[PDB]
Amino acid sequence: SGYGLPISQEVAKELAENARKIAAPGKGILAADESTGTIKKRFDSIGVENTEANRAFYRDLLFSTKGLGQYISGAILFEETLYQKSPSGVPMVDLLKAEGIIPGIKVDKGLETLPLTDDEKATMGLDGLSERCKKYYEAGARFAKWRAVLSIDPAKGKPTNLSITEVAHGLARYAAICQANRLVPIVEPEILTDGSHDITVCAEVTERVLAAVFKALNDHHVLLEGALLKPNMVTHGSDCPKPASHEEIAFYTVRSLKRTVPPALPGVMFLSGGQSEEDASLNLNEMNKMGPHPFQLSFSYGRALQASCLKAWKGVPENKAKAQQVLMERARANGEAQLGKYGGGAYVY
Amino acid sequence: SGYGLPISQEVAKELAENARKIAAPGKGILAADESTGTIKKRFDSIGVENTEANRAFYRDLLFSTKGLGQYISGAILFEETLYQKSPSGVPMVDLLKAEGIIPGIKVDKGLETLPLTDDEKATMGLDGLSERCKKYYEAGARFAKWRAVLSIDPAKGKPTNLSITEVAHGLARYAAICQANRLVPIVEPEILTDGSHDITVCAEVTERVLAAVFKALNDHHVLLEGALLKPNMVTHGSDCPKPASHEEIAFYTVRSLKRTVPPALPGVMFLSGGQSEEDASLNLNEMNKMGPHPFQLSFSYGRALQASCLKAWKGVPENKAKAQQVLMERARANGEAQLGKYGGGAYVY
Amino acid sequence: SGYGLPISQEVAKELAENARKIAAPGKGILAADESTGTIKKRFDSIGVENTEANRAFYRDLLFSTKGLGQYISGAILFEETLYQKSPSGVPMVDLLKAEGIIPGIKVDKGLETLPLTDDEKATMGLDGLSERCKKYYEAGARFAKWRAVLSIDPAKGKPTNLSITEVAHGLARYAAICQANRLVPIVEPEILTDGSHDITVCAEVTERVLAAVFKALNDHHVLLEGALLKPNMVTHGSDCPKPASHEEIAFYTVRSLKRTVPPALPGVMFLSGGQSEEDASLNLNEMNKMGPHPFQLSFSYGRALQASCLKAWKGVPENKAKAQQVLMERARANGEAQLGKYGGGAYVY
Amino acid sequence: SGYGLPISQEVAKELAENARKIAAPGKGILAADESTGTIKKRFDSIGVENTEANRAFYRDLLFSTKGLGQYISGAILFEETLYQKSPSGVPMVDLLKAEGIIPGIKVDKGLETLPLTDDEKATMGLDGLSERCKKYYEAGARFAKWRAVLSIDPAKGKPTNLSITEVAHGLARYAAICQANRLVPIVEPEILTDGSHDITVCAEVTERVLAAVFKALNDHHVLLEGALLKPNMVTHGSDCPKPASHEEIAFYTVRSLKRTVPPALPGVMFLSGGQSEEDASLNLNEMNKMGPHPFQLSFSYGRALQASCLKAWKGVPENKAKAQQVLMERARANGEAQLGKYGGGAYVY
C-alpha cells in the first residue's frame, strides 16, 4: 500500500465548497490579519498609537462597511480580532457574517532564520496548529493563512535550495493539518520584490518555487480542490526604476501560474506585495482580460485595499464614513478587475 | 544564477505551434510506431508473416486512406517506416503530407530491467538521441515519442520509488533533447493495467507518477507549451471482472489530470492500453462531455484505431478499401469523441 | 553562491569537543528523559504514584550514584528534572557535575499523526526551539535529544515516503537549530520493533531511513563532527518468536551503519528499544568485538539501564543503595560492552 | 514490499573481493583508458602521430613493465586496448595478468551538454551498457569506469542542481548495471579545477556532490562493498596563483570524504586532475600520514603516472626501457604515498 488514506468525503466537500465560495467571481479576500507589530507600522504611517481600542476601531471600521460582501468573499483575521468585539460591542465575526463574508484566520507564528543561511527564513507554527485549527473553526473561521517568504539575490544564490525546501515543506504540513480540521488552507509562498532583478528573473524563480510547492502539496496528500494559492505577481524588483507595464506583469504572472499550478486548484488570490492600490487593480484586471482561465485569478490584498482607507481615517473617528467609502471604492475596483472589467481610477517562451 | 538558459524564441514558437496543431480540436494521433517485434504480434493475430513488404503494404494502407487528415493530426512512425516507400514507390511521409498529417517518430530504444527490482523497467535511448532527432527532423518528423512503463502491484510495492524516479528522469532528459532539436516531445508514462486493482488505486498511482513526471520536466527546463502528454486512462485493472463505467473512467481520469498537469500543456493524448476500440471512443467522449477543459483531451491510439482495420485486411490485398473504410470509421468516432459528440457504434475526492 | 554560510569555528569546536566527550571510550549515555506520561508507565510497573516528589527521589537516586561518571558520559533529562532539586535540596545538574556527567536535554514536544497516513507520526517541537536551547544551555545542558518514530508494516507500506521525509526534515531542522545554540544534537530516528518482520527487513528499512536522514543533515548544513546518532539496533520484530542471535544483530547493525553513516560523525549511541538489559549489553558487546570502527559504537539506554534499578527500588526509600548498586552493575556492563570486554551477567551482502 | 531485491550473494562476494584487491594497501590504479581523441592530445605534447601502432606500442610499454604489479593493483583500459595485442603479438590483458594486475574497462560514451545549461555535461553510455559489461567480463575485465564532470562557477551558479542530479543519476544507473554483470564500478564524479575559486569553495561543492551521489547509489541499490570512488582531491582552482599546501589539500580532502562517504566503501582512488606528478604523490602521502582511515585512500592516476613516462619515450622505441624506469619510479612513489611513507622526489570546521 503506502499511499495516503482516503480523505473524509464529508470534510472534502466542505473544503471544496468553501474554497469555491472564497474564489467567487467578482470577489476576493480582504487581508486584515496584520499582527501586532505589523499593524503598528501601518498605524505609524498615519500617526496612530497601537492600542487595542484603535485596532478594534479600525477592524470594526473595515468589517462594518455596508455592502462590503458584494466584493469581498472572505476576510483574513489575526487571532486577536477573531475573538474581538467592535467598540459598540459586536463580535468581529458577526460583522463579517452580516455581510456574508467568510472569516479566515492567520495561523503561522511568523519567521525565523534558517541556520547558516544568509538571513533566509523558515515559517514557524506547526506546533499545536491542529489544536488551534479546531478552536478557530469553532470560533467561525473556515479558512486559514500561512505566509512563507523567499528572497531573490543572484549574487548570493537566493533563494537557496534549503529556503525552497523549507518553505515547501512547511506549507504542505500546514495545508494538510488545516484540511484535517475542515479549514481551507491559503498557501502563500511570497517571493519578495527586494532587489533590482528583472521581471524575467522573477518569473524563473516563481516557477521554481511553485513547482516545488505543488510537488510537496501532492506528497503530503493536500486536496487542491479545497485549497487556495496566494502568490506574488511576477514583477520587476522593487529597486528597479522602471515598473513593468501592466501587460508584461499580466503575461508573465499568468504564464508562471499556468506552467506550474494544476487546474484542480479553484483559485489564485494574489498578494499585493507593496504595489500601489491602482497597480494592484490594473495588474489583476489585465490578467483577466486574458481569460477564461483554468482557475479564478483574484486578490487577497492587505495594503492594496487599505492604504487610502487608513489615510482617510487618520485615526479620526469622524472620518469613519469617508474611510469606509474609500474601502468600497477599492473593493469594487478589484472585484471589477477580477472580471476584467475595471476601467481605471484616480508570447514570450 | 544557476537557472536554465533562455530557450530559443524561434525554436519555442515552432514547438508550441506544432504542439497545438497536433492537439487540434476534433483530431488526434494515429500511433503506427509498432517496432518489428510488436508489429509481429499484431500480424500474428491475423495470420500474416512479418516481412518488410507486408509492413510496407499495411503502413501504406493506413496513411494512403483518403480524407484521413480530417480526424488525424499526426501519425507516429517507427524509424523503418519514416524512411520507407509504399509498394507503389511513394515515400510514407509524402502520404502523410498529402493528408496534412504531421509525421512523428518513436525515438526510445525500448525497455530494460532496473537491477534489483522485480522486473521493473527503465526506458533506454538517450545515447545518440540528439543526433537522431536532427536526422529525423530533416526526414520530416516534427514530434517524437518515448514510452516508459510502470506496473501496479500492491503486494510488491509496485511501482517502486526507483521505478518512478527512473521513468521521470528518462522522460525529462528525452523531452529536453527533443525540444533542443525542434521536435515536440510526447511524454508517455504508461501505467499498465496488469492486475486486479481498483480504479481508485489506478487514480492514486497515476497522480503520484504524473506529479513526479511534471516536477522532473520542470527541473530539466522542458517547455510545456511545446510538449504533449500520453497517459493511461484511469481504469480498473485488466484482471477485474467488472470494467468500470465510462462515467467513472471519465471522472477519475480528468480528476487525476487536473490534479497534476499544469494547464500550459496544450494537449493530453491518451493511449488506448488494451481497451476495446469502442471503449476507447466512449471513454474519451465521456471526458469531453465534461468540458471545457484546460487542455485538449484527445487520443494517441494504436490498437484502438487499428484492431478492426487489421481484421478487415487479413493480409488480403483486395480487402484494402474495406480496411481503409474501417480505419475512417474509427478515426471519425474518436475525432467526434474529442469534441464530446460521439453517438456510439457497433464528485469523489 | 547559495551554499551554507561558514559555521562559527568557536561554536564548531565546542560542539565537536563535547560530542567526543559524550562518545568517550568505555562510556555511554543514561537516558533519564522520560516525560511525565512515560515515567508514569515506568512507575506503574512497580506500583509507584507519579508525584513530583517520587520523580525527584528517583532521578536523585540515579544521578547521586557514587562513581557513576566512570561509565556514564552524559545524562539526558526531561525539562522538569533540569530545573529540579533532589529531595535534599541539591540541583540535579549539580549531581551530574559532581560525577563529571554532561547534562543533556530532551527538546522535542512529542508525536502527532501525519494527516492521511495510517497513524504515522511527525515529531513536533521546532517552534521556540532556538529560544529553549539558549535557556537550556544557560541551565547547563550541552547536548539535546529529539525522538522521531517510524514503523515497519509491509502490508501497509510502512514506513511510507511521507513518514521518512517528515522524520528526516524534522531531525535536520532540529539539529541545525541546536548547533546554532551550542548544543550537540542527538539524532534519533527510531524504527520501532512492532511487527513480525525479519531482521533483514529491519536492515533494509534502517538503511533507507538513515540514508534519507544523513542526506537531510547535509542539506541543512549540520556539522556531523558535532552531532551524535541514536538509532535502533537492527533486530527481528518484537512479535517474532525467535530473538535473533547477538552475532546476527551485531552484524546487521554495523553493516547498516557502515553503509549509510559518514565517518566524520563521532558516535552512534544505540537506543535499547524494549530489549532486555542483558541483550542490550551483549548485543553492543558483540558489535565492539568487530572493532575498530570508524565511529564509537556505544549506548544511550533508558529502559536497559533502569529496568532492574526500578524493581530494586520499588518506591521504597530504604532500597536506595541497593537500587544504586544495580544501576552501577548495568552501567559497568555497558561500558565494558562499549569496549567489547563484557563477560556476561545474570558476510551477508 | 517495494525495496530492492536481494543481490546474488555469489556475485556480491566477487565484487567485494575484487574491490578490496583493487584497493590493496601500497597499491593503486593505472588509468590508461584515454580515448582516441584524449590520447591524441597526450601524444601531441611529445610530437607523436596517433596511429594504432603507436598506441599499441605505448600501452605495451606501460603494461609490459617488469614488476609493475608491485604498486599497481589494476589498470583501466579503453575498449580498443582491451582487445589489442602488443606489437610483439601478446594480448594486452595477458601482460596485465602476468603482473597480477586486474584489467578494468572505461564504459562511458563521453559527455553531452545538458540542454539549456551553460555547457554543463551529462555522461552518456547506459544504452547497451549491460550487454557491453558481459562481453568485457568475458574479455577479462573485472571493474569498470564512468567519468562524470562538474564545474565550479559561482557567478553562473555552477554546478547547477540539474548538473548534480544528472551526474548522480547516471553514476548510480551505471553502478548498478555493472554490479549486475559482476564488474566493480568506479564512481567518478570529477569536479574540474577550472576557475579561480578557493579550496574552501571546492570543499563545499565536493561535499554537496558526494552527498547527492551516495544518496543516489543507495536509491539504486548499489553495493558499496563492491564499488570504488574516484573523486577529485579538494584544491584551489587552476587559475589560482597560489597552489594550496599539501597539508591543506590533505585536510580538506579527507574532511570532505569523511563527511559524505559511508565507510562500507572499501576504497577512494583519487584522480590526479592536472596536478603535477609530484604534487599528486605528495598530496596523497599527506592524507595517509593522517591515517588510519575508514577506507583506503589511494590513486587512480592517468597523467600523474604517465607525464614523465611519455616525455622519456618521445615516440622513440629505444627509449622504452628508460620510459619504463620512469613509470616504476612514479608507481613506487604513489604506492609509498598510499602508505604515507613517501619521502619525496625530484581542524577547520
How far is it, in rounded angstroms, from Cα C164 to Cα C212?
7
Contact C46, C311 (CB under 8 A): yes
Contact D320, D313 (CB under 8 A): yes
Contact B276, B238 (CB under 8 A): no
Q: Which residues of D232-245 are buried (b: 16+ CB within 10 A; e: fewer)?
A: bbbbbbeeeeebbe
Pairing of β B111-113 and β B121-123: antiparallel
Contact A327, A277 (CB under 8 A): no
C255 is in an annotated binding site: no
Using CB atoms, which residue from C127, C157, C165 is nearest to A2? Answer: C157
Contact B4, B221 (CB under 8 A): yes
For residue C56, the one-letter residue type is A
Would you call B115 an interface residue with chain C, using a CB distance cutoff of 8 Å?
no
Helix (H, G, I), strand (E, B) or coil at D318: helix
Q: Quick count: other Cβ atoms within 10 Å of Cβ A25? A: 11
Please name the residue that has the C-alpha cell 501525519.
Answer: C114
Instruction: Kindly give the interhelix angle for B161-180 and B9-22, rounded to the nearest 10 degrees.
Output: 110
Chain C residues 124-163 with a CB less than 8 Å from chain A: 124-128, 130, 155-158, 160-162
**How far B88 CA sits from the closest chain D CA (Å)?**
37
Instruction: Kindly give the interhelix angle for B320-338 and B303-313, rounded to the nearest 10 degrees.
Output: 160
Q: Quick count: other Cβ atoms within 10 Å of Cβ D126? A: 23
How far is it, in rounded angstroms, from Cα A205 to Cα A226?
26
Chain B residues 13-52 with a CB less than 8 Å from chain A: 13, 16
**Nearest residue to B246 (alpha-carbon basis) of B187, B304, B289, B294:** B289
In chain B, what are the domain boundaries? 1-349
Contacts of B206 in chain A (CB under 8 A): none
How far is it, in rounded angstroms, from Cα D205 to Cα D193?
11
**Cα angle C255-C261-C264, degrees, rounded to a multiple of 5:** 130
How far is it, in rounded angstroms, from Cα B191 to Cα B209?
9
Cis before C159? omega within 30: yes
A110 is in an annotated binding site: no
Q: What is the DSSP string of D221-239?
A: T--GGG-EE-PPP----TT
> Quick one: cell of B188?
508517455
For A160, the closest chain C residue by CA position comes to C2
Instruction: Report chain breaks in chain A, C–N > 2.5 Å, as residues after which they occur.
Output: 346
B118 is in an annotated binding site: no
A230 is in an annotated binding site: yes
Q: Quick count: other Cβ atoms within 10 Å of Cβ A67? A: 12
**How far D89 CA sits from the closest chain C CA (Å)?**
41
**Annotated active-site positions of C, please?**
188, 230
Which DSSP state fits C293?
-
How far is it, in rounded angstroms, from Cα D231 to Cα D299?
10
> Quick one: cell of C294?
570508524
Q: In this complex, which chains have at least 3 CB pairs below 8 Å with chain D?
A: A, B, C
Instruction: Kindly give the interhelix angle for D303-313 and D52-63, rounded to the nearest 10 degrees.
Output: 110
Dihedral sign computed on CA atoms, order C107, C110, C115, C116: positive
**Nearest residue to C253 (alpha-carbon basis) of C306, C198, C206, C309:** C206
How far is it, in rounded angstroms, from Cα C292 to Cα C288?
7
Contact C157 B161 (CB under 8 A): no
Would you call C215 an interface residue with chain B, using a CB distance cutoff of 8 Å?
no
**Cα angle D224-D225-D228, degrees, rounded to a multiple of 5:** 65
- 3-class DSSP string for chain A: CCCCCCCCHHHHHHHHHHHHHHCCCCCEEEEECCCHHHHHHHHHCCCCCCCHHHHHHHHHHHHCCCCHHHCEEEEEECHHHHCCECCCCCEHHHHHHHCCCEEEEECCCCEEECCCCCCCEEECCCCCHHHHHHHHHHHCCCEEEEEEEECCEHHHCECCHHHHHHHHHHHHHHHHHHHHCCCEEEEEEEECCCCCCCHHHHHHHHHHHHHHHHHHHHHCCCCHHHCEECCCCCCCCCCCCCCCCHHHHHHHHHHHHHCCCCCCCCEEEECCCCCCHHHHHHHHHHHCCCCCCCCEEEEEECHHHHHHHHHHHCCCHHHHHHHHHHHHHHHHHHHHHHCCCCCCCCCCC
B286: phi then psi, degrees, rounded to nearest 5 = -60, -40
**Nearest residue to B285 (alpha-carbon basis) of B253, B238, B323, B259:** B253
C272 is in an annotated binding site: yes
How far is it, in rounded angstroms, from Cα B117 to Cα B97?
44
D177: phi then psi, degrees, rounded to nearest 5 = -65, -45
How far is it, in rounded angstroms, from Cα A19 to Cα A72?
14
**Annotated active-site positions of A, please?**
188, 230
For B176, the closest chain D residue by CA position comes to D115
> Quick one: cell of C217?
543533515
Contact A148, A125 (CB under 8 A): no
Total length of chain D: 349
Helix (H, G, I), strand (E, B) or coil at C171: helix
Contact D55, D39 (CB under 8 A): yes
Helix (H, G, I), strand (E, B) or coil at C198: coil
Q: Which residues of B291-321 are buried (b: 16+ CB within 10 A; e: fewer)?
A: eebbbbbbbbbbbbbbbbbbebbeeeeebbe
**Cα angle A111-A115-A120, degrees, rounded to a multiple of 5:** 50
How far is it, in rounded angstroms, from Cα A70 to Cα D228?
69
**Nearest residue to D216 (alpha-carbon basis) of D191, D252, D187, D259:** D187
Task: For the domain covering A1-349, report its CATH number.
Answer: 3.20.20.70
How far is it, in rounded angstroms, from Cα C86 to Cα C96?
12
Q: Which residues of A282-300 are buried (b: 16+ CB within 10 A; e: fewer)?
A: bbbbbbbeeeebbbbbbbb
Give long-range contacts, CB 8 A cutoff, 24+ apart: A13-18: A13/B347, A13/B349, A14/A182, A14/A226, A15/A179, A15/A182, A15/A183, A15/A184, A15/A223, A15/A225, A15/A226, A15/A227, A16/A223, A16/A225, A16/A226, A16/A266, A16/B347, A16/B349, A18/A102, A18/A142, A18/A143, A18/A184, A18/A226
Q: Over the Cα atoms of chain D, what is R_g? A: 19
How far is it, in rounded angstroms, from Cα B209 to Cα B218?
14
Would you call C169 an interface residue with chain A, using a CB distance cutoff of 8 Å?
yes
Dihedral sign computed on CA atoms, order C38, C39, C42, C46: negative
Contacts of D124 in chain B (CB under 8 A): 126-128
Which DSSP state fits C85?
B
Cis before A91? omega within 30: no
Contact A295, A263 (CB under 8 A): yes
**Residues ≥6 apart with Cβ < 8 Å to C313:** C46, C58, C61, C319, C320, C322, C323
Q: Report CA dihedral (D37, D38, D40, D45) to the nearest 10 degrees.
A: 150
Dihedral sign computed on CA atoms, order D204, D205, D207, D208: positive
Q: Quick count: other Cβ atoms within 10 Å of Cβ B192? A: 18
**How far A1 CA sits from the closest chain D CA (Å)?**
9
> Quick one: cell of A180?
484535517
What CA–CA distances, in Å, run from D269 to B59, D23, D25? 55, 8, 12
Instruction: Kindly give the interhelix angle for B277-287 and B320-338, rounded to the nearest 10 degrees.
Output: 20
How far is it, in rounded angstroms, from Cα C296 to Cα B338?
66
**Residues ≥6 apart with Cβ < 8 Å to D161:** A161, B2, B219
**Nearest residue to B15 (alpha-carbon basis) of B224, B297, B214:** B224
Experimental technique of record: X-ray
How far is it, in rounded angstroms, from Cα A103 to Cα A92?
9
Contact A116 C180 (CB under 8 A): yes
- End-to-end distance of chain B based on CA atoms, in angstroms? 41
Please, which residues bridge with residue D268 across strands?
D229, D297
**How far A181 CA sits from the closest chain C CA (Å)?**
10
Q: Report CA dihedral (A34, A38, A39, A43) to the nearest 10 degrees.
A: -150
Contacts of D204 in chain A (CB under 8 A): none
Cis before C292? omega within 30: yes
Which burial class, exposed, middle or buried, applies to B218 when counting CB atoms under 10 A from its CB (0-12, 13-18, 19+)? buried
**How far B198 CA sits from the closest chain D CA (Å)?**
19
Instruction: Report chain breaks in chain C, C–N > 2.5 Å, as residues after which they occur.
Output: 346
> Quick one: cell of B85?
516507400
Q: Within 13 A of C201's CA, how many CA atoms are on the CB side? A: 23
Dihedral sign computed on CA atoms, order D241, D245, D248, D250: positive
Please, which residues bridge with residue C300 across strands?
C29
Q: Which helix (H) or strand (E) holds C102?
A: strand C102-106
Q: Over the Cα atoms of chain C, what is R_g? A: 19
How far is it, in rounded angstroms, from Cα A105 to Cα A174?
13
Contact B9 A348 (CB under 8 A): yes
What CA–CA distances, in Å, run from A282 to A241, A278, B177, B309, C247? 19, 6, 40, 57, 73
Which DSSP state fits D263?
T
Which DSSP state fits D99?
T
Q: Quick count: other Cβ atoms within 10 Å of Cβ C338? A: 28
Contact C176, C139 (CB under 8 A): no
Q: Quick count: other Cβ atoms within 10 Å of Cβ C14? A: 17
Helices vs. strands in chain D: H and E counts, helices first:
12, 10
Q: Which residues of B243-280 are buried (b: 16+ CB within 10 A; e: fewer)?
A: bbebebbbbbbbbbbbbbbbbbbbbbbbbbbebebbbb
Q: Report CA dihedral (C192, C193, C194, C199) to the nearest 10 degrees.
A: 130
How far is it, in rounded angstroms, from Cα A126 to Cα A129?
5
> Quick one: cell of C57?
527521589
C42 is in an annotated binding site: yes
Q: Within 13 A of D161's CA, how many CA atoms are on the CB side? A: 18
B137: phi then psi, degrees, rounded to nearest 5 = -55, -50
Contact C209, C167 (CB under 8 A): yes
- 3-class DSSP string for chain B: CCCCCCCCHHHHHHHHHHHHHHCCCCCEEEEECCCHHHHHHHHHCCCCCCCHHHHHHHHHHHHCCCCHHHCEEEEEECHHHHCCECCCCCEHHHHHHHCCCEEEEECCCCEEECCCCCCCEEECCCCCHHHHHHHHHHHCCCEEEEEEEECCEHHHCECCHHHHHHHHHHHHHHHHHHHHCCCEEEEEEEECCCCCCCHHHHHHHHHHHHHHHHHHHHHCCCCHHHCEECCCCCCCCCCCCCCCCHHHHHHHHHHHHHCCCCCCCCEEEECCCCCCHHHHHHHHHHHCCCCCCCCEEEEEECHHHHHHHHHHHCCCHHHHHHHHHHHHHHHHHHHHHHCCCCCCCCCCC
Contacts of A115 in chain C (CB under 8 A): 176-177, 179-180, 220-221
How far is it, in rounded angstroms, from Cα B335 to Cα B315?
27
Q: Quick count: other Cβ atoms within 10 Å of Cβ A9? A: 11
Please, which residues bridge with residue B9 across strands?
none
